[PDB]
Ligand binder design. Structure first.
Ligand code: MGD
Ligand code: MGD
Ligand code: F3S
Ligand code: F3S
Ligand code: FES
Ligand code: FES
Ligand code: 4MO
Ligand code: 4MO
Lengths: 821, 133, 822, 134
């Protein structure tokens, strides 16, 4: 069909992608419904000539990138959400996820039709609408009763701590202030992990923050490692816009101009991943087989790999002895504790000795001109959710520090990231490590709030969680429905009494009902970026403002303002009861807009008279304002900000550690021991009992829990059910083929998937889409966690049983190769 | 009026097509490259006596690079950012960066003459405000 | 959207009866390729209308909601346009707001039908997943077999439609009925709208008068129309609009006079018996004038007293047909004695003034100046069918009708107005016990319960108690199933059955959509609606039509009769595998490929040689009807019973029943019955004694039923985001509520919630709440009370009302203006 | 081609000439399309002018095209044919009746510099036409 072009004078605002870490820059064009731009280039806002065919690469523009929104005043506007060609992050690229933004904006008839737009209450064994005031009276009423009788230990949360949509500096501050400073509860987990902890404890403790470089570094590297990472699918436009140009030779002249006395061989790439992925396939396509190494490790053997590599580089002297001497502690000890021969490393990991030696030679042997290769070490959930998070990072960082691959351009040892980041919160208010799902399963807590997450789909050991929460919720449902004519006070009492008899009151604060609606008693409508202003940063710390351009559905609210509403409701109740001390805990939420939360949190960190604030913006965050970010555009500024003035704008920081001052007591990077212990017993027990490694993770097309995707007809046609990639010989043995349904099960749970034969999958290994709306992978993940309560989500084994042939999947779903050749 | 005026462009006659040997043609104008193929086994929107002849725009719906037709896998493959589309599933994106399936060229099959004629497009071709410029 | 794609001159056109109400308005479906369009000139589009200039008023019913674009299984896209048939005698080109949405409610992947069931769904491992048809059948048949083997049919429960139109019809009631009654042979079956296997019209049928005994033309020929417990502008819209209003306007006077040259015809008049003043009353007064309309605004539940007072009076005045009584009735003298009630006592009980009672009788029953009795058509619906003792009210009403000879004469009738269309063909119900199914389920009976084309979570009486029990029992099964690991079908059948021995219940839903039932169900099967399948049904004058298939169902959705065949064949195969030949034989006779096969097996076999016992609304001449013959008849179809068929005359049917005074009784006479006046039932009176407001309930013109399609329609959801309750303004002031506040409505039976809707004409201490809705379920406050045949008094409940608060968004976005026209 | 109709810009009057709840009849976007504008006196959704209270509509009923009457007192449009009513204060929402579309809204520009009210488009499809602009 056809597209309505933006008029030359259409309104244009800046929007960062809602979704992944990379934080691609976009423009939103908004104009009245019945107006349209001309085809001539100066008569539309795109500046493109639609009077004749456009050349390739000229535009990213499909109908899915357009919509028509209806504002609260009833006025209808065209919108068009398209990538910004001048943004340095993406240079005009759009992934398939961010490309759907316009479709996932709220409209009454489109993909956002089922957005929450009113408070919802489960009462009298049914979902109904309720008023905001009533919702707040019930929720604040229960929180007050709980604080008064049980203390904060009775009030539980699982809340986002991320950036982008359903996070960001405003939102993490508002929620954090509410949970930690006002309620003061320690009973808080994070959207992606079941305790209040870091993904990167070991690296941070060693002195190296996990976002320590620029995306430009990937362009300057001689070698890139991708460790536990599938970046074409999970950090698409970083891979496309920065990594692949390096592999293609497009950045060679830049390297040579920066470093006139240094050789730059063709760039090479090394993947550490048990599974062969789309990312490996494309790297081989672009660079050739001889420039790519896939270290197809046995699951969970990363620590053995890095200790072998570290041992080898030290034996070869392919280290930076002056750097070690001047800027590190603990090297000699780590050499002893982490000793592992290449033979033993090979035997454990399954990687041939020759491939281990080649990886080390490409990465760490000095170049002919004398300098060490610039090797950027990138890692994500294959080790963060790997076999003992803390230990793997200890082992990896040891190898990086010894080879001076932090602080030089074209280097880094960095997370690839998941969501964007946008953390500003008060300190966590205890010193205990608390496994929240286990406490809920054991019957603790009076009230649980899921806030911008859906652990029904995403917890580890998820089936046990669902079973418990459904049971405890039903106790409350049964008690509430016996009420007749109950006032708020009476109903709060009924609920509290049920929670003394095993019940749990459950609230969800979300864009959509989700699966949580099967258990929740109360749901509150939130707003996403574009319905609200929002700040957050990408995987090179580049902070941008996403600008409001439309209204939220109904009475949906920015999460920081929901937090303020709850706090003010609690304050008012305490004031009414003459409890001045408790009322004072709830001060400081006089917020009318999300910029008020940015001012109160991010911009107050480290300032005179401010309380303790842990912020990714640091003490110079006050230099950032929305107006200054707006002026910076979608290029924003890399944090930390160094300076601001009118003439220069915001000026930031490209790379960390360039002078070798690390984030430790003595300014030195600290080596750590990395013991190799095998798989944890809980995991090994499943592996001993069951046949298949149940690897799990991302698909390029699907975003997270498919909260928008579940409503997208193209998405549902392609992926009607979660899929499991399986080795063809394994499939033959089980008499399955593409589009059959299997049950996947072990001691922890059972789930279901559509079979997806993939040639490159190893016998006895599988890969299932995580987090989905039709067949939840997490049911088979174990309860095992590392010392800081980080789950080994990637570490579980199970059996597979044929259910049968799903005719419609066979007729409608492609089971062709997603790995490009 | 709500509809574009698409030309009726003769492609060839059905018996001249060999199984899995694609034919290149332009439609609905010379700046719009397309492929037709007789797949040899029935599919979806397949025409002809064996309900197996399909056609597509070959411009990738991501950013417009021309795709190549892999006769063996019955897929269209984009070399720019690695999207692939299934010719046997009405252009379904198998994997990649696009937000629209590969546009299908609607074919009339006329038993009386054996002719295959392109008569419309389902989906919006890359790089244009409307399929008919 | 500021434009419509016209159907080309040569677009495909099929016939479709409205999916929804009884009236069964005729429509055409135009279907054409997506990229084609008709011309504006009248001979260049299929409508024959001139779109080169503004069309005059009344020329067309055509909006964007009456169009869509569907995608077939082969991927080809087609425009569709679903518009009323100007030449259909039922509607004469009228479309209600409900049927006008049909094109919008056809399945598309992106529109209002996006969430249609299109695959079997299984709740296992504490989650909804897809499953295969074969696996769903192995589980479902597995559990039914196990239950039959160990407990017998008493373990196997159903609540199934028995109606016509969408989610019903002659093919579908036959398929389901053969399965439940001939194959499974379970008596544990209720109907979509009542909790036992019973008739709405036992008393009338026993007295010899089938409840659809006239033609819609009779409403045009009447002197007087009574609308009893009925809101016909809202609930039978185009019957009211196309037949009643023309009579009140004087448009049919010449027809009356030509048919009956020696008979006076005064201006037509209309009498409503309804405690509540409705939009129908408002419109009648607008059209005819106040002086032609009587609103008998009876006290709730006093119908029987009203009709006994009227009967007493007409007999005392001699405004009866003594020769008809003598020749064609039994029991008159006894009824005069048992039903005696003075006008004063009638007035005291009903609250209706004596002068209005006398006026109603004089308009209706006093002979005209030319000598003949008035032709008074008595129409009734759920205000008495769900009234205070269904059996007794009908006894009282029919007595008045029979004595005044207001059946069998043109312009008369004592008829249901109907709800859904009708389309019943089934084997006899297989026991002789009256079984209150919801009560049995609540008490813990049954192993497996299937909801089939109904949603009793929203529509049962005493619905809260039902939900509470079903959620509890379903959760027992969930808990047990989720402990399984690697269970084969046989193993999981065992796990489930053992949970049902421990209080559990396995729950299946066969439906277009998940519905609220998804909160309890373990298995959901996807069904198809008219247009995705062929379907037959009749309207409220017995006019049978064929609705023609024109598109594919979504995914693997199936016609209900074919789902029944799939189940039967799965059970037959299991029994055959286990060498149980007798049990396998119970499941024979479902070798069906198309829904016409079910029409042939059921409707067309009734009364035929070698056929089993069949209870069919088509009767023994149903075999004369075929799909091809119905197609030839068009949207005018034929009124049942069919009299004859030949090529030259087509199907010939029957306009009015009882025109020779041969009634459906042992002796061919209509039988008078006693009608005791007993007051409100005690269960109801107990709530009235404790609580302040009458909780009347029923239909809204815009909303269809449980809003299964409406809940996905943005215009519907904007207008009615929550169920509303009509309340008297002085009552609102006292409770400090206004339009768009939320209240809780409650009594001993339950609690629910609604948005307040002040309405001037609502009486103090009375209210009216939308029934069946997706946001605030009215039925929570209805009692368990039923009449002798287990018919609920759904209109009989009292409760209290408590303010929750002001819902600001409702105040900003929802009109609380008068729905009653003036 | 282009996706939008070419609507005329039709002057109605100037805002200060309209008296509260006294409707103005006009045709738009052609002489076969009767419309009403009214200054409602209190702000509403799509209302223009200094008090955000001036609205306009097509008066042809969206059921079968009978012209509706404007009830100044209830701020409603009422169809005499099959008794549909539409709420002028809620962007043409059907209160009750047989239509399947709300009453089409005539989009008004209010120009503070001149005080002019100009009709410039229609939201919704007017009865009895294939497109709003014939
Ligand atoms: N398309 C898309 N992109 C996303 C997301 C999404 O939902 N969709 N989610 C975002 C989020 S929140 C995150 S956290 C990231 C995740 O980004 P990634 O971590 O890149 O993705 P995953 O698929 O979770 O896992 C990465 C790889 O870990 C490998 N792996 C498994 N076990 C091991 C092991 O023991 N050792 C090692 N070395 N590798 C192993 C798997 O084979 C897999 O290829 O993606 C983000 N980007
Ligand atoms: N718009 C619309 N039309 C529908 C339906 C729908 O959902 N939407 N549903 C269809 C169905 S299945 C049905 S069964 C019918 C229902 O059609 P109706 O029975 O006409 O509609 P109801 O609103 O249920 O009730 C009719 C009237 O009964 C009155 N009533 C209440 N109590 C009493 C009483 O004690 N005595 C008397 N005499 N009257 C009393 C109420 O005031 C109400 O006006 O409508 C059908 N048509
Ligand atoms: S478009 Fe969005 S999903 Fe990631 S690759 Fe770019 S931020
Ligand atoms: S359009 Fe449909 S809802 Fe009834 S009034 Fe006519 S059958
Ligand atoms: S242009 Fe084809 S994948 Fe980007
Ligand atoms: S033409 Fe207006 S209600 Fe029918
Ligand atoms: Mo993550
Ligand atoms: Mo009914």
């Amino acid at each position: 069909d056809r597209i309505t072009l933006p008029p030359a004078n259409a309104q244009r605002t800046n929007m960062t992608c809602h979704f992944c870490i990379v934080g691609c820059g976009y423009h939103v064009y908004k104009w009245p419904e019945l107006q349209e731009g001309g085809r001539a280039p100066e008569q539309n806002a795109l500046g493109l000539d639609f009077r004749k065919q456009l050349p390739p690469l000229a535009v990213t523009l499909t109908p899915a990138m357009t919509n028509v929104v209806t504002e609260h005043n009833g006025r209808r506007y065209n919108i068009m959400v398209v990538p910004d060609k001048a943004c340095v992050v993406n240079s005009g690229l759009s992934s398939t996820r961010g490309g759907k933004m316009a479709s996932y904006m709220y409209t009454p008839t489109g993909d956002g039709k089922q957005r929450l737009k009113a408070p919802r209450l489960y009462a009298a064994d049914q979902w109904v609408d309720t008023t905001w005031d009533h919702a707040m009276a019930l929720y604040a009423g229960l929180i007050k009763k709980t604080l008064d009788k049980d203390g904060p230990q009775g009030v539980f949360f699982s809340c986002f701590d991320h950036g982008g949509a359903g996070g960001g500096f405003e939102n993490t501050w508002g929620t954090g202030k509410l949970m930690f400073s006002a309620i003061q509860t320690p009973m808080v987990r994070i959207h992606n992990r079941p305790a209040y902890n870091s993904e990167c404890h070991a690296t941070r403790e060693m002195g190296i923050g996990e976002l320590n470089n620029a995306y430009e570094d990937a362009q300057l590297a001689d070698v890139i490692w991708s460790i536990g990472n599938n970046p074409y699918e999970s950090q698409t436009n970083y891979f496309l816009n920065h990594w692949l140009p390096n592999l293609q030779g497009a950045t060679t002249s830049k390297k040579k101009e920066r470093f006139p006395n240094e050789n730059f061989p063709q760039a090479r790439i090394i993947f550490v991943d048990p599974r062969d992925t789309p990312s490996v396939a494309i790297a081989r396509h672009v660079a050739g087989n001889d420039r790519v190494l896939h270290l197809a490790i046995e699951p969970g053997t990363d620590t053995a790999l890095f200790n072998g590599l570290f041992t080898y580089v030290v034996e070869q002297g392919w280290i930076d002895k002056p750097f070690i001497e001047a800027h590190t502690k603990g090297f000699d000890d780590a050499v002893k504790t982490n000793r592992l021969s290449l033979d033993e490393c090979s035997n454990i990991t399954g990687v041939p000795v020759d491939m281990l030696k080649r990886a080390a030679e490409w990465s760490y042997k000095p170049k002919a001109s004398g300098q060490a290769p610039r090797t950027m070490h990138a890692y994500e959930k294959g080790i963060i959710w790997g076999n003992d998070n803390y230990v793997i990072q200890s082992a990896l960082l040891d190898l990086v520090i010894a080879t001076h691959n932090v602080g030089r351009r074209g280097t880094g040892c960095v997370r690839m990231g998941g969501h964007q980041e946008g953390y500003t919160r008060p300190p966590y208010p205890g010193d205990k490590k608390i496994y929240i799902d286990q406490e809920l399963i054991k019957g603790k807590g009076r009230i649980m709030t899921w806030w911008g997450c859906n652990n029904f789909q995403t917890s580890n050991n998820a089936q046990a969680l669902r079973e418990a929460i459904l049971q405890r919720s039903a106790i409350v449902k049964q008690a509430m429905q016996k009420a007749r004519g109950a006032t708020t006070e009476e109903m709060v009492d009924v609920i509290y009494e049920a929670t003394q008899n095993g019940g749990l009151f459950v609230t969800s604060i979300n864009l959509y009902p989700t699966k949580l609606a099967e258990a929740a008693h109360l749901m509150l409508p939130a707003a996403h970026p574009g319905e609200m202003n929002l700040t957050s940063m990408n995987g090179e710390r580049r902070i941008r403002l996403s600008e409001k351009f439309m209204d939220p559905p109904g009475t949906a609210m920015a999460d920081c303002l929901i937090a303020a509403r709850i706090a003010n409701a609690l304050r008012d109740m305490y004031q009414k009861d003459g409890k001045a001390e408790m009322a004072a805990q709830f001060e400081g939420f006089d917020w009318k807009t999300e910029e008020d939360a940015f001012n109160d949190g991010f911009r107050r960190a480290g300032q005179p008279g401010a309380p303790a604030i842990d912020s990714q913006g640091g003490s110079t965050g006050h230099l950032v304002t929305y107006d200054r970010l707006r002026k910076s555009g979608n290029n924003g500024v890399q944090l930390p900000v160094v300076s601001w003035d009118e003439s220069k704008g915001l000026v930031g920081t490209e790379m960390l550690y360039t002078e070798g001052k690390f984030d430790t007591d003595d300014g030195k990077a600290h080596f750590k021991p990395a013991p190799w212990n095998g798989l944890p017993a809980t995991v090994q027990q499943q592996k001993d009992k069951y046949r298949f490694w149940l690897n799990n993770g991302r698909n390029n097309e699907v975003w997270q829990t498919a909260y928008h995707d579940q409503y997208n007809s193209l998405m549902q046609e392609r992926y009607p059910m979660a899929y499991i990639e399986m080795n063809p010989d394994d499939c033959k043995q089980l008499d399955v083929t593409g589009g059959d349904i299997v049950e996947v099960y072990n001691d922890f749970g059972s789930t279901f998937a559509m079979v997806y034969p993939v040639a490159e999958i190893k016998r006895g290994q599988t890969f299932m889409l995580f987090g989905y709306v039709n067949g939840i992978q997490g049911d088979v993940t174990t309860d095992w966690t590392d010392r800081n309560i980080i789950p080994y989500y990637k570490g579980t084994w199970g059996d597979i049983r044929k259910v049968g042939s799903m005719e419609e999947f066979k007729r409608t779903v492609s089971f062709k190769s997603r790995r490009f050749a | 009026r709500t509809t574009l005026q698409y030309p009726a462009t003769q492609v060839s006659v059905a018996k001249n097509l060999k199984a899995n040997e694609p034919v290149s043609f332009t439609y609905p104008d010379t700046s719009s490259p397309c492929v037709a193929v007789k797949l040899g086994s029935p599919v979806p929107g397949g025409v002809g006596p064996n309900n197996d002849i399909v056609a597509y725009s070959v411009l990738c719906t991501h950013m417009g690079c021309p795709t190549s037709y892999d006769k063996s896998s019955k897929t269209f493959k984009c070399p720019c950012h690695f999207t692939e589309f299934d010719a046997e599933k009405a252009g379904q994106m198998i994997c990649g960066q696009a937000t629209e399936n590969l546009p299908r060229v609607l074919l009339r099959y006329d038993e009386a003459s054996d002719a295959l004629t392109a008569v419309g497009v389902d989906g919006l071709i890359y790089g244009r405000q409307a399929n008919v410029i």
